[PDB]
Amino acid sequence: GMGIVMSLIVLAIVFGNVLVITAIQTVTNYFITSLACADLVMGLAVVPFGAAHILWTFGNFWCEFWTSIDVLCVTASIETLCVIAVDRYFAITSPFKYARVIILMVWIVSGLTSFLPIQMHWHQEAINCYACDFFTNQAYAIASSIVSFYVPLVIMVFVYSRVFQEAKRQLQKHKALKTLGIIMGTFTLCWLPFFIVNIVHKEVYILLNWIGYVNSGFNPLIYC
């Protein structure tokens, strides 16, 4: 009955995210709201997955909906962290600077790119699935994997380096390394291995996805 403990443990992820949502204020705080809202939707997505391993797929058409929701949520979270990193770094690097519409842009990019094809339906093993295993061939992953992890990490690696350099020079006219490590190591360790696993194209790959869903949940505390 270890699954009940794990399912109940991940049920606690909704607790903290909701409390951050309940507190609800500045220009940057509006962007941080997007990340928290998407994660809470994660608890609904995780529960079907946990039960499926325990064994279902009651819904013939509902099997793909969960995959579409999961892809949309993952890409929305990655884009949200990329946006917040870019905003903070650009504001810090250039002094004397001169929001809702933007968060909308990233959400529109995610919901569409990550859901249209799975609902749309854009080999022999896949035919067996049609008769909830996930089987994409055709390098759909190359577009989703590139547009949802590497494009976001590539932006994050650059802005953070400039911001840390500007921090190391001002003392010249530590805690910075610790904070940057806390920011970057969690995201890298939780997402980059999954991206490496996906591009190899099964228990291992399913296992990596199972390990990684929690990292978006832990995200509320580090940002808060």
Added chain:
Amino acid sequence: ELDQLRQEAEQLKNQIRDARKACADATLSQITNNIDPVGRIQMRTRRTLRGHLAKIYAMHWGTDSRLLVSASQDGKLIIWDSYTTNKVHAIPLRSSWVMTCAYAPSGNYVACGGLDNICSIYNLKTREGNVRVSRELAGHTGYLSCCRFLDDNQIVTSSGDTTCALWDIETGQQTTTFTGHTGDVMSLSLAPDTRLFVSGACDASAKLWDVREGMCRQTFTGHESDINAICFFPNGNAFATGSDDATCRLFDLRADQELMTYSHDNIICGITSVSFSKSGRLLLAGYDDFNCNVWDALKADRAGVLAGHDNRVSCLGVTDDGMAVATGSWDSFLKIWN
């Protein structure tokens, strides 16, 4: 010489203190120890008014207890409508530093002071539906601290130059002048019959001036720190004082003595404003510990606590009919309690 004169001054102070001892028959608590306690007092925020950009420094209620005026540190006076939370005017200012505001009894003029040494006066009801500066009073030195209206043509001010003067809007000159303080004047309050008024100085003293003659009558010096606010009992024969230390006292005119002291062992902050109620049974008093408190005039015990501003209370007032209590704060918020 000065030594002989200084001896005479000391030869009279002892007479004042000695004579005051004979007047003391019993304390206030002894004569008021046989009345029922009022009990717990609880009341919630009926309305919240927002729109200011910086801290509020003062406010004043209208005569009809429906309109009010507030002044902020970004240089804007705005007249609210309490019933429906609707703004009526928004007056820009020449100087961004403002400490006071006032509202005439007839509801036709609004005066604002400030640190620019100018007690500029505005007009509300006029042709074309616009507000323009009527007169500017500039014969006075030091930053102002309060402004009050006796009628449509008389206004009293008090500044930090140890001076209080009674003006005249039509002529624009100082009719009289009150002198005698050894420190800055922080606040003043008019009597109910508009014949006498007091002033809380900065050297831990309070006086009682006369509008017509222009001389000091008495002097009360029971405090030990700065004085920040004063208000009269509705009767007109007593006034309460809120000092820099946590103590708030209550003096008397005829008895010429201090009567009761309001303090608690768990409060070490300052006092910003005080005000009575319609029946003179409660003594509301703002504080510097982010909220307010409600004392009792006779039992001298804290009844209820008003909280929620999340920043220091900078002004306070009670309507004429005693129906509502309004407070300001430093976080651009106004509240109405009931």
Added chain:
Amino acid sequence: ASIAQARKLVEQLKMEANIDRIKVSKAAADLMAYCEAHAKEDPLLTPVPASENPFR
């Protein structure tokens, strides 16, 4: 100059001492009497009905 200042201070202080006073007992009795008479007409002590309250 300053000596005049001390001369003016003592002149003002003399008139203050010659003032009439009353006992505290005859003074504290009046304040207690005042509050009892106007206790009914005070909507802050005794809560007002919701119909009569203009703010709700």
Added chain:
Amino acid sequence: QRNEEKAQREANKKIEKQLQKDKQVYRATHRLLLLGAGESGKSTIVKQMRILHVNGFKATKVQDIKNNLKEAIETIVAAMSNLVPPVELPENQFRVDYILSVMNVPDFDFPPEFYEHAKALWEDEGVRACYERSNEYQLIDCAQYFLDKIDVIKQADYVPSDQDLLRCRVLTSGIFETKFQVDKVNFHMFDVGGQRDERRKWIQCFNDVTAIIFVVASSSYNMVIREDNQTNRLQEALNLFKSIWNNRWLRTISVILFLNKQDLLAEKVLAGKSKIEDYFPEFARYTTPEDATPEPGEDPRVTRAKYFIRDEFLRISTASRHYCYPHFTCAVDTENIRRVFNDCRDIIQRMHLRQYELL
């Protein structure tokens, strides 16, 4: 009637729209506060900052230059009888009584008779001897510049230049404020200049300014406060700096430090006369710090004196969120201020404020 409600709601909407429009400007301004002791040079910076960044920066003005010239010449001649040591000079003996006669009068000697013989007293050897030791008596800092310019002001159509306007001294009553714009961003700087007060109860109002500019004279270390025989003019500034720094309200406000009158200090040290060691006894053991960046034209002797003053001010700040920025300035030189503010802005106070969450 619902018409009144509709009209009131429309008025509320209009006022809300205006307030929302006006909110943007307030959040985009930086406010600076000047401070320091009296007769230090606070108002000069405000006047100069107008000329540097605003095009707009006169008959009534020409009155006070004449007022300054009259006060300086009267003080030097009339104070001789008060000096304990006699250095008495017979030229202009009939004019000394004339100056004493006109020393107190609401109306100035507008007639050209006064100007003619006033030049001789300035050229008199006795007056120059009296001027040589100006520590004992209180004298205006612009005495030498205007006295030599007595020929230009005598002729009609004076049309005083900008440089002559900077050295004028006029007392200020109210708030002296200015509003300029630097490139895209705009600034707002205001003096206080009310009067000397030991309490300063109005310091509460300035609880949100971005920075506080402190201005202290550096060439006045052998003079006393206006209240005669009070203390060293520099020691009165050090006491004021400590009180402002250790204040309850100003708990998270940075301070920019200016040291003016550098040219006056440089000239005093060069020509012997009073020495710093006479007034400050701890200066005798001072050694120049290794991390020293002298100006190219500065002589080695005067570079030791500049950093002694800076060390005294910096020690108070470093004993106890807060930061202190030292600087060397000369308020008269127009091009000089145009560089320090820029360099000081470079290391923005704002980057430090944003960097607070993690360094």
